[PDB]
Scaffold this active site. Structure first.
Site, PDB file in Angstrom:
ATOM      1  N   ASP A  44      63.791  28.443  66.404  1.00 13.54           N
ATOM      2  CA  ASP A  44      64.646  28.116  65.263  1.00 13.54           C
ATOM      3  C   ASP A  44      65.055  29.368  64.509  1.00 13.54           C
ATOM      4  O   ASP A  44      64.365  29.862  63.626  1.00 13.54           O
ATOM      5  CB  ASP A  44      63.981  27.117  64.329  1.00 13.54           C
ATOM      6  CG  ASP A  44      64.929  26.636  63.244  1.00 13.54           C
ATOM      7  OD1 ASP A  44      66.069  27.122  63.192  1.00 13.54           O
ATOM      8  OD2 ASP A  44      64.506  25.782  62.447  1.00 13.54           O
ATOM      9  N   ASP A  65      72.193  29.018  63.557  1.00 15.48           N
ATOM     10  CA  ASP A  65      70.998  28.198  63.454  1.00 15.48           C
ATOM     11  C   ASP A  65      70.728  27.280  64.617  1.00 15.48           C
ATOM     12  O   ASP A  65      71.342  26.218  64.720  1.00 15.48           O
ATOM     13  CB  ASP A  65      71.138  27.307  62.185  1.00 15.48           C
ATOM     14  CG  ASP A  65      69.889  26.509  61.904  1.00 15.48           C
ATOM     15  OD1 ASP A  65      68.837  26.753  62.530  1.00 15.48           O
ATOM     16  OD2 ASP A  65      69.948  25.606  61.049  1.00 15.48           O
TER      17      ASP A  65
END
Ligand SMILES: *[C@@H]1O[C@H](CO)[C@@H](O[C@@H]2O[C@H](CO)[C@@H](O[C@@H]3O[C@H](CO[C@H]4O[C@H](CO)[C@@H](O)[C@H](O)[C@@H]4O)[C@@H](O)[C@H](O[C@H]4O[C@H](CO)[C@@H](O)[C@H](O)[C@@H]4O)[C@@H]3O)[C@H](O)[C@H]2NC(C)=O)[C@H](O[C@@H]2O[C@@H](C)[C@@H](O)[C@@H](O)[C@@H]2O)[C@H]1NC(C)=O
Ligand SMILES: *[C@@H]1O[C@H](CO)[C@@H](O[C@@H]2O[C@H](CO)[C@@H](O[C@@H]3O[C@H](CO)[C@@H](O)[C@H](O[C@H]4O[C@H](CO)[C@@H](O)[C@H](O)[C@@H]4O)[C@@H]3O)[C@H](O)[C@H]2NC(C)=O)[C@H](O[C@@H]2O[C@@H](C)[C@@H](O)[C@@H](O)[C@@H]2O)[C@H]1NC(C)=O
Ligand SMILES: *[C@@H]1O[C@H](CO)[C@@H](O[C@@H]2O[C@H](CO)[C@@H](O[C@@H]3O[C@H](CO)[C@@H](O)[C@H](O)[C@@H]3O)[C@H](O)[C@H]2NC(C)=O)[C@H](O[C@@H]2O[C@@H](C)[C@@H](O)[C@@H](O)[C@@H]2O)[C@H]1NC(C)=O
Ligand SMILES: *[C@@H]1O[C@H](CO)[C@@H](O[C@@H]2O[C@H](CO)[C@@H](O[C@H]3O[C@H](CO)[C@@H](O)[C@H](O)[C@@H]3O)[C@H](O)[C@H]2NC(C)=O)[C@H](O[C@@H]2O[C@@H](C)[C@@H](O)[C@@H](O)[C@@H]2O)[C@H]1NC(C)=O
Lengths: 87, 239, 238, 87
Positions: free
Chosen positions: B216, B33
């Site tokens: 992201d 992430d």
């Protein structure tokens, strides 16, 4: 927020483009619409959600919808982000 | 690149792969992430939390390279939160072994957010906040050649891979053309400047003077200023 | 033709990675020269917490999967697995073994399997009910030599745990020539042995000749009471 | 079995040798004792366990205790097992 579209109408939807490094990075309907469910029960969900946040300016989050058609390089040594057409 | 991690694509809305924590390595499924900076997994000591009990847990007493820390740690994600304490151990990723990695072992997790997901925890790849991230320790320990990592995320299909993360390089088989590189403008997320956003050839105007964005991999969709997104969703007829 | 890095778990088990399916679903298995089946936990494992603590096989996510459905069960040296046979490609190192049958286990004994880091077992002993991975390797011509070899390291935090080579030997992990003895009974990898000595003392019982098999899936040495009592007495073990 | 020894006493234990193919394959105490844990709480377990079983003749199982100091070759084509000093 979980807006859905008619799955039948992706062929008449427009491309949506982001300008990055002066270059246009387009997304086709097939890329920016999330398919949920299968074959005939499929639901089509808009990949664009609204969120108002500021950090230096109005902020966008480029999540998996974008990172699928664009291969992404995180260059820590030079502090750069790079995008190319995925294959 | 020095380490390749195969990713699983779950319904086009999350991508995850395997890591090991401990000696011998305890296995976890984690989201890699770029939108956050902490590494956490469920703790064996999870305190009245159903999310933990259904996910793989870390047992510090089973690992010979565990080093106690015990500092309180908590993370409030873009939905909910996890809470626990810091611990230190070796983190195995592909064939790299990251030594002395701090991470949170979560003793409480938001069931509503984490309980029915296929991953166990999250490996943050954004810039340092309270603890040295995995990637920085990688670099510090000389485990990678290039100071770069890259993601190929595939569409959700059945005969194909879900995706591939490469630490310390690129896979040329997963892109065409040169990458367009832009400088990070605010070092928190992997954030950079962007220009106008267009619907076909129509300007949405609001970001014409210049906006910001970050990449992201731990987020499903595209999020942006209502003033532009309203126009896009109108144009495509969402509702 | 293929190298598999092994993890050493506390000097008591050794395992490595394999992939099953297309695209490969990854599993940690003990490469076990004492048993002849390949099993991993099934996605269809209803109420076996052992299964749910481990990686599970999902035939629906594999393009090379071919159903079988035949019932399978195994009674190990302590525990046992049950499930059904399936067929898929199994990837090991650089090798892809096609049409390899394995049991996807829908029940496992938790007492035995829950508290273990491996997901399943890849049997390397002689064929019983199903064609083992190795035989398929041979049948499909994927190995250069009809041999596989093990280096097992001591338990050392910063060292490799060991290394398994299919189709060859790694000369970095031995010295001298190997001493080769014939397989005397083809079930385990079994051969004849002679006297067992304590220092230069004979323990007598195996001087006329015994049998042994090399079992990478077993932690310790197990042998005749008559000799083990002698050894354990001599060294002052309980 | 699960018999233990005093961890302080390995230095004077005897080697134990298996005769295989007419060659002595020795094991040192450091090799045939299983250590559990580190420094202080270390337990030292005998690697020798009793099991009376026959296949053709009295049978030994040579597990990881043996397969650590001796690199092992399983020769299917010739149906042989081979042992060499590990490195
Ligand atoms: C579902 O799974 C099970 C478990 O894997 C399948 O059953 C086994 O299938 C294998 C084949 O993959 C069998 O082994 C093969 O046996 C023959 C010899 O036959 C044996 O039994 C005969 C009569 O029943 C008898 O005539 C004979 O003397 C002997 O005892 C071998 O010729 C064959 O070896 C050749 O191929 C292998 C690689 O494929 C090479 O390694 C060899 O060097 C040779 O080239 C192989 O060893 C095994 O015996 C089966 N065991 C059991 C108990 O099921 C099952 O397969 C299906 O049913 C079996 C019984 C066979 O009829 C298969 O042909 C048949 O497909 C699976 N179901 C399916 C249909 O996939
Ligand atoms: C329990 O866990 C917490 C959370 O990680 C620790 O606190 C943090 O520790 C790290 C150290 O691992 C600090 O980061 C460092 O800060 C210094 C000073 O700015 C940097 O120089 C250092 O960078 C160097 O080394 C890095 C790798 O270690 C490289 O990436 C750098 O490029 C460079 O070579 C690194 O940035 C955190 O700031 C600190 N955060 C906070 C706010 O807690 C606890 O660590 C201890 O407590 C710290 C406050 C500090 O005193 C450490 O020295 C202590 O070890 C940790 N407790 C224990 C028992 O370790
Ligand atoms: C919206 O964005 C999509 C995706 O970029 C555009 O479609 C694609 O256009 C490419 C070039 O404009 C096509 O590439 C060609 O591929 C073939 C493969 O054999 C090459 O031989 C060829 O020389 C090109 O490189 C690509 O095929 C096409 N992708 C598809 C099929 O989805 C789209 O362009 C519009 O649709 C395509 C099909 C053409 O009709 C274009 O003229 C047309 O502009 C974009 N739409 C808009 C509004 O511009
Ligand atoms: C039990 O087995 C171990 C391993 O087989 C023995 O230790 C090793 O033994 C060799 C001799 O076979 C020894 O070699 C040295 O001998 C020569 C001196 O110039 C030279 O030929 C050689 O290269 C070495 O310098 C080796 O050092 C030793 N290494 C170990 C302990 O791993 C062990 O005996 C031991 O060695 C003998 C020589 C003597 O020193 C004993 O007190 C050592 O314990 C065997 N123990 C018993 C009780 O027999």
């Amino acid at each position: 927020e979980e807006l859905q579209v008619d799955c039948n109408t992706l062929s008449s939807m427009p491309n949506v483009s982001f300008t990055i490094g002066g270059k246009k990075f387009g997304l086709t309907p097939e890329q920016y619409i999330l398919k949920v469910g299968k074959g005939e029960a499929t639901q089509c969900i808009s990949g664009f959600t609204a969120m108002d946040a500021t950090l230096l300016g109005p902020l966008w989050i480029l999540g998996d919808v974008f990172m699928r058609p664009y291969h992404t390089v995180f260059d820590y040594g030079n502090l750069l982000v790079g995008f190319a057409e995925a294959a | 690149g020095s380490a390749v991690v195969a990713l699983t694509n779950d319904r086009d809305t999350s991508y995850f792969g395997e890591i090991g924590i401990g000696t011998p390595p305890q296995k976890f499924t984690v989201i890699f992430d770029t939108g956050s900076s902490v590494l956490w997994v469920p703790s064996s000591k999870c305190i009245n939390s159903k999310a933990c009990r259904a996910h793989s847990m870390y047992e510090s007493s089973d690992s010979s390279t565990y080093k106690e820390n015990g500092t309180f740690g908590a993370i409030i994600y873009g939905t909910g939160s996890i809470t626990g304490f810091f611990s230190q151990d070796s983190v195995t990723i592909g064939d790299l072994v990251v030594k002395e990695q701090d991470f949170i072992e979560a003793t409480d997790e938001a069931d509503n957010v984490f309980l029915h997901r296929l991953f166990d925890g999250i490996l943050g790849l954004s810039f340092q906040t309270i603890s040295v991230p995995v990637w920085y320790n990688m670099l510090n320990q000389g485990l990678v050649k290039e100071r770069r990592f890259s993601f190929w995320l595939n569409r959700n299909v059945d005969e194909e891979e879900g995706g591939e993360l490469v630490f310390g390089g690129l896979d040329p088989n997963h892109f065409r053309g040169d990458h367009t590189y832009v400088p990070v403008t605010y070092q928190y997320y992997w954030q950079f400047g962007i220009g106008d956003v267009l619907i076909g050839d129509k300007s949405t105007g609001f970001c014409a003077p210049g906006c910001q964005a970050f990449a992201d991999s731990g987020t499903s969709l595209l999020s942006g200023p209502t003033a532009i997104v309203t126009q896009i969703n109108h144009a495509i007829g969402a509702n």
